[PDB]
Amino acid sequence: ADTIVAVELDSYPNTDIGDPSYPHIGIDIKSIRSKSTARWNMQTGKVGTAHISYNSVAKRLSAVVSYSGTSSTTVSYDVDLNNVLPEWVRVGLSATTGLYKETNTILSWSFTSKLKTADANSLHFSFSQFSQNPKDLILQSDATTDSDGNLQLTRVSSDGSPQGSSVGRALFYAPVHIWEKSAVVASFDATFTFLIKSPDRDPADGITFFIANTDTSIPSGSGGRLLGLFPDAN
Amino acid sequence: ADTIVAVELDSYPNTDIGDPSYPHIGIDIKSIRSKSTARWNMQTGKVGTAHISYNSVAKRLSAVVSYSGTSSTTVSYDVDLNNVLPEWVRVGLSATTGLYKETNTILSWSFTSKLKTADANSLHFSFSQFSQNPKDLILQSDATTDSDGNLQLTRVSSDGSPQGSSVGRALFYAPVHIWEKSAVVASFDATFTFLIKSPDRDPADGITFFIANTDTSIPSGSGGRLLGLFPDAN
Amino acid sequence: ADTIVAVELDSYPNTDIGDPSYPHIGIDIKSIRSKSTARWNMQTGKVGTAHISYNSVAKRLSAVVSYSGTSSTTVSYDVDLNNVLPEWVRVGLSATTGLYKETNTILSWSFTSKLKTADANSLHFSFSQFSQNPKDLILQSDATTDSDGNLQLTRVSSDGSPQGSSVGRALFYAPVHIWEKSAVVASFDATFTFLIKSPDRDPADGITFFIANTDTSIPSGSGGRLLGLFPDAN
Amino acid sequence: ADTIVAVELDSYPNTDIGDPSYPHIGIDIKSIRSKSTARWNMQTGKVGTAHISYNSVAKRLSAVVSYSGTSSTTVSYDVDLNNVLPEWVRVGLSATTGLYKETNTILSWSFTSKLKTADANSLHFSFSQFSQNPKDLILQSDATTDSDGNLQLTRVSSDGSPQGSSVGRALFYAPVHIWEKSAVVASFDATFTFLIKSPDRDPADGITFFIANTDTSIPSGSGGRLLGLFPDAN
Numbered sequence: 059a060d061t062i063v064a065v066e067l068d069s070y071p072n073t074d075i076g077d078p079s080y081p082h083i084g085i086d087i088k089s090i091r092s093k094s095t096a097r098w099n100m101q102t103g104k105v106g107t108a109h110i111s112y113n114s115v116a117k118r119l120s121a122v123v124s125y126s127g128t129s130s131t132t133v134s135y136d137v138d139l140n141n142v143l144p145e146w147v148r149v150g151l152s153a154t155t156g157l158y159k160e161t162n163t164i165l166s167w168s169f170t171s172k173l174k175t176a177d178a179n180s181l182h183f184s185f186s187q188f189s190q191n192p193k194d195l196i197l198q199s200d201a202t203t204d205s206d207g208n209l210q211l212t213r214v215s216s217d218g219s220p221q222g223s224s225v226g227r228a229l230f231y232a233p234v235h236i237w238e239k240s241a242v243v244a245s246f247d248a249t250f251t252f253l254i255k256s257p258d259r260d261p262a263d264g265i266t267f268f269i270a271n272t273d274t275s276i277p278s279g280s281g282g283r284l285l286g287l288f289p290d291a292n
Numbered sequence: 293a294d295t296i297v298a299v300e301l302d303s304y305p306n307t308d309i310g311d312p313s314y315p316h317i318g319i320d321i322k323s324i325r326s327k328s329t330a331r332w333n334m335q336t337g338k339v340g341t342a343h344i345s346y347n348s349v350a351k352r353l354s355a356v357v358s359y360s361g362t363s364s365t366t367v368s369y370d371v372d373l374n375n376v377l378p379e380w381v382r383v384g385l386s387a388t389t390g391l392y393k394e395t396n397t398i399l400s401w402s403f404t405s406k407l408k409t410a411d412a413n414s415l416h417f418s419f420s421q422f423s424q425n426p427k428d429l430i431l432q433s434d435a436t437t438d439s440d441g442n443l444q445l446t447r448v449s450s451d452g453s454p455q456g457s458s459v460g461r462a463l464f465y466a467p468v469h470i471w472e473k474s475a476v477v478a479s480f481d482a483t484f485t486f487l488i489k490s491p492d493r494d495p496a497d498g499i500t501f502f503i504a505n506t507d508t509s510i511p512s513g514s515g516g517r518l519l520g521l522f523p524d525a526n
Numbered sequence: 527a528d529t530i531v532a533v534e535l536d537s538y539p540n541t542d543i544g545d546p547s548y549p550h551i552g553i554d555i556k557s558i559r560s561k562s563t564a565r566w567n568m569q570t571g572k573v574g575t576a577h578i579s580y581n582s583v584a585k586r587l588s589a590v591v592s593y594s595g596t597s598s599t600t601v602s603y604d605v606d607l608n609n610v611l612p613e614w615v616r617v618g619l620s621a622t623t624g625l626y627k628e629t630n631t632i633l634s635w636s637f638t639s640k641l642k643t644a645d646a647n648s649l650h651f652s653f654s655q656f657s658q659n660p661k662d663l664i665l666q667s668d669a670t671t672d673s674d675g676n677l678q679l680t681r682v683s684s685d686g687s688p689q690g691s692s693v694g695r696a697l698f699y700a701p702v703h704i705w706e707k708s709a710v711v712a713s714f715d716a717t718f719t720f721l722i723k724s725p726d727r728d729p730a731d732g733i734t735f736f737i738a739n740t741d742t743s744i745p746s747g748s749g750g751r752l753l754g755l756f757p758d759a760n
Numbered sequence: 761a762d763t764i765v766a767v768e769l770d771s772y773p774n775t776d777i778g779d780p781s782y783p784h785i786g787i788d789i790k791s792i793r794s795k796s797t798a799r800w801n802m803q804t805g806k807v808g809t810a811h812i813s814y815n816s817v818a819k820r821l822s823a824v825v826s827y828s829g830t831s832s833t834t835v836s837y838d839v840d841l842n843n844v845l846p847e848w849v850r851v852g853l854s855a856t857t858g859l860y861k862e863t864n865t866i867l868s869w870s871f872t873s874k875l876k877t878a879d880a881n882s883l884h885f886s887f888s889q890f891s892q893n894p895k896d897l898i899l900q901s902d903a904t905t906d907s908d909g910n911l912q913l914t915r916v917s918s919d920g921s922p923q924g925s926s927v928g929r930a931l932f933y934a935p936v937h938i939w940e941k942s943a944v945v946a947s948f949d950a951t952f953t954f955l956i957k958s959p960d961r962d963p964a965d966g967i968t969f970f971i972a973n974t975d976t977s978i979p980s981g982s983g984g985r986l987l988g989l990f991p992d993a994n
């Protein structure tokens with residue numbers, strides 16, 4: 059099975075599998091059952107931004123979600139990620155819907171990785187718009203780019219109405235070398251902006267930024283509450 | 293056949309096929325017969341640096357090669373590259389040896405691409421050292437990374453002595469989107485540092501930075517004087 | 527007197543002093559009488575973007591202005607800027623109004639300078655919003671930042687209505703080293719976004735990005751058609 | 761008195777004032793008596809690198825010092841720096857000698873600051889060499905740049921032999937805005953490389969990277985063990 063590190067924006071509480079009884083952001087280390095969570099004042103219909111960062115000296119994975127003119131939500135987890143992840147990874151965004159649904163629209167995405175052992179090795183990309191058929195993305199499941207240059211991670215109709223029972227992911231094409239033996243320091247930083255809109259009283263299921271082994275794929279039975287990341291709820 | 297734009301550092305003059313009677317840097321648009329050339333005061337055995345840049349407004353492809361404490365060599369060619377290249381490309385370094393030989397050692401390589409249609413789309417990578425089996429490079433022909441973390445584009449012995457009759461290329465794994473319809477401006481910048489050492493009175497054949505269609509491969513019969521780039525000398 | 531290199535967005539034609547009979551973008555080398563001009567399809571009331579770039583190998587100063595969903599305007603001038611400018615400069619934006627007026631609102635500004643003689647020396651800044659009293663800007667004349675986090679280079683009223691007879695400039699606080707002896711290559715890149723709105727049939731006078739000697743100041747009698755840059759019309 | 765946050769590379773143990781009985785790296789919050797320390801396997805005569813990073817979500821200030829082919833030294837301190845520092849700061853390097861001495865040579869220095877409230881405000885600079893009279897640095901006390909393009913923070917002779925009883929500091933010219941009200945996330949990153957050589961059995965006194973209020977100056981009586989940062993030993 060895949061090795062996954064993720065920051066989930068979980069719009070739908072599945073208390074059955076450990077979710078708190080509210081919308082929340084969480085840090086997932088190798089399991090859908092977050093190591094750390096925080097309550098998320100979800101602003102359905104408004105543009106959000108998520109920012110995630112880590113470095114190997116501090117060993118502290120942190121995430122913040124904010125909307126214009128609102129309180130931010132932060133979560134942090136102390137973890138040595140080079141003991142969790144392989145040296146080469148792909149980074150991606152994932153989203154799902156289930157019985158309940160929402161648009162999982164990514165409007166921009168940027169990522170920087172640095173690895174030092176003069177002078178640091180690095181990878182940086184940014185998308186403020188995604189072309190149709192972006193050749194530097196691996197689109198998995200239902201993921202597509204729409205006519206507006208936005209990434210629709212889950213199925214959306216002609217008008218833009220979200221559909222249930224969907225999974226989609228977008229990975230950056232190039233593997234990233236996130237650690238080496240005798241590296242001095244390695245660090246990464248990711249940001250995305252998202253629009254989550256719904257006709258439903260309870261939107262589902264959420265959006266994640268995740269880091270996995272390079273050949274990662276959507277696991278069988280990972281729909282809905284498993285966010286396209288995990289084959290089970292352990 | 294591939295679509296190639298290259299800046300060649302041509303160490304060996306093949307007057308037979310248009311080379312001036314001296315070592316030279318050149319700008320190659322779709323043919324080994326450079327559109328523009330300049331005499332290159334080659335410092336065999338010393339670390340060089342090459343820098344290449346372009347933008348779509350200025351439409352002027354420029355390259356400079358320098359060594360510590362020596363005169364630089366510049367070449368420029370006025371060309372609209374978005375009329376030459378496809379929209380998605382891979383960028384690479386190539387080198388050859390023939391009957392005469394030299395090490396074609398790349399010590400570092402960095403590249404930035406920006407495409408604007410807020411806010412610009414971009415790709416940047418840098419290597420100050422290359423791991424063995426770098427997963428973000430496509431190594432073609434004889435190309436390998438050595439124990440020192442340097443890229444050896446052509447065959448080199450245990451001690452580091454160069455071998456003749458060799459071809460090698462290294463492409464960055466992710467395609468780069470270098471143009472779009474209604475783009476405002478698109479630009480790129482590449483730098484590499486190289487060590488060319490030889491036991492021969494005349495080193496051969498040279499090193500290139502090149503931009504090609506994404507599935508580019510080493511053409512049959514492109515050895516020696518064709519620098520791993522072209523199937524013929526037209 | 528100051529040494530000025532500028533890209534002017536000239537909204538008001540002063541044929542008296544060399545302006546074409548239309549709104550235009552121009553490249554000004556040491557005089558308000560542009561070395562190169564292009565007709566500018568001014569979209570009064572809409573957000574514009576301007577991008578300017580140069581490098582010392584290509585020796586070609588280029589600028590492009592665009593609005594969402596419209597044709598871009600480009601201008602270029604072949605010039606060796608290291609023969610014009612001192613080695614240390616300040617970079618700024620300037621604007622004026624005269625008898626006729628317009629808002630000269632800067633919404634964002636970013637700049638990168640690189641100087642290579644391993645590894646390149648560099649300066650980069652970006653503002654997507656400007657605080658009140660920005661300590662890293664030198665504000666000259668009427669220039670101020672407003673409550674929205676935008677830079678108002680010329681006087682604007684409580685409601686936001688533009689005022690005539692105004693001059694204002696904003697310089698980045700730190701001098702930039704744009705050339706050195708035996709530099710391999712030096713390059714810069716600047717972008718800004720602007721909103722020019724007017725109640726007048728003919729807006730005036732325009733907005734510039736400029737590069738000058740470090741202690742540059744607004745010259746006596748440089749109002750209106752002289753864009754805050756030049757003491758005279760020679 | 762100044763507000764100081766610093767990472768000290770303390771070569772000389774002053775147990776009198778809290779130093780451990782060995783060379784150490786430390787995190788200084790508003791006092792020479794470090795909040796956090798780690799033993800430093802000082803490699804006198806060899807080129808070191810120091811890297812320092814912080815972000816406002818993680819709230820963890822971290823530093824690592826390394827030499828080629830040796831074990832790194834890391835230190836971290838949990839601290840909300842936006843409760844310590846003003847919003848606008850200058851960043852600098854400082855060094856001292858006392859009765860015992862060492863060269864405090866800075867070979868390169870780079871710094872990135874980002875402040876987000878689209879899209880983040882930022883400042884980045886890098887020096888791989890320092891010109892004589894660098895106009896973007898404020899040199900305080902004995903600090904100068906030498907003929908090799910290196911920064912000598914303390915007095916050095918014609919041949920390069922270090923002198924005792926010296927203080928010197930180098931600040932970047934532009935203030936940096938490291939926090940704002942309702943910022944989402946703010947982060948910084950600094951790296952420098954240093955050469956500490958000595959004819960003495962015990963080198964003294966060390967080198968710091970520090971962040972202070974903008975008009976910071978070398979305090980009276982801050983020589984030797986106070987590293988040019990503090991007026992007293994409290």
Ligand SMILES: OC[C@H]1O[C@H](Oc2c[nH]c3ccc(Br)c(Cl)c23)[C@@H](O)[C@@H](O)[C@@H]1O
Nearest residue numbers: 070072155156157158262263281282283
């Ligand atoms: O999209 C919201 C959720 O829908 C389903 O779980 C249910 C949530 N409320 C229900 C009510 C009835 C039934 Br049957 C089911 Cl499966 C559910 C499942 O698809 C979950 O994976 C998902 O988290």
Ligand SMILES: OC[C@H]1O[C@H](Oc2c[nH]c3ccc(Br)c(Cl)c23)[C@@H](O)[C@@H](O)[C@@H]1O
Nearest residue numbers: 304306389390391392496497515516517
């Ligand atoms: O490496 C130098 C050159 O060697 C060969 O061309 C020759 C250069 N001098 C010669 C002398 C004799 C013969 Br046969 C040949 Cl093929 C050559 C060929 O391999 C060329 O492609 C290459 O440029």
Ligand SMILES: OC[C@H]1O[C@H](Oc2c[nH]c3ccc(Br)c(Cl)c23)[C@@H](O)[C@@H](O)[C@@H]1O
Nearest residue numbers: 538540623624625626730731749750751
């Ligand atoms: O703002 C537009 C222009 O206004 C003035 O020039 C005039 C343009 N039309 C006029 C009509 C009458 C008189 Br008087 C004047 Cl000065 C002008 C001057 O202030 C010019 O510097 C400026 O370019």
Ligand SMILES: OC[C@H]1O[C@H](Oc2c[nH]c3ccc(Br)c(Cl)c23)[C@@H](O)[C@@H](O)[C@@H]1O
Nearest residue numbers: 772774857858859860964965983984985
């Ligand atoms: O440079 C090393 C140290 O030298 C001095 O302190 C002493 C260290 N060993 C000593 C021995 C004798 C005397 Br007197 C003094 Cl002041 C010292 C002082 O200058 C200290 O500030 C500094 O840390």
Ligand SMILES: [Ca+2]
Nearest residue numbers: 068070071072
């Ligand atoms: Ca859930």
Ligand SMILES: [Ca+2]
Nearest residue numbers: 302304305306
């Ligand atoms: Ca040749």
Ligand SMILES: [Ca+2]
Nearest residue numbers: 536538539540
């Ligand atoms: Ca005019």
Ligand SMILES: [Ca+2]
Nearest residue numbers: 770772773774
């Ligand atoms: Ca000490």
Ligand SMILES: [Mn+2]
Nearest residue numbers: 068077084092
């Ligand atoms: Mn959850």
Ligand SMILES: [Mn+2]
Nearest residue numbers: 180416417418
């Ligand atoms: Mn980089």
Ligand SMILES: [Mn+2]
Nearest residue numbers: 188189413469
């Ligand atoms: Mn694209």
Ligand SMILES: [Mn+2]
Nearest residue numbers: 111247815947
């Ligand atoms: Mn960050």
Ligand SMILES: [Mn+2]
Nearest residue numbers: 258259260261
């Ligand atoms: Mn409900």
Ligand SMILES: [Mn+2]
Nearest residue numbers: 302311318326
């Ligand atoms: Mn040639």
Ligand SMILES: [Mn+2]
Nearest residue numbers: 182183184414
């Ligand atoms: Mn970028």
Ligand SMILES: [Mn+2]
Nearest residue numbers: 179235422423
């Ligand atoms: Mn690597």
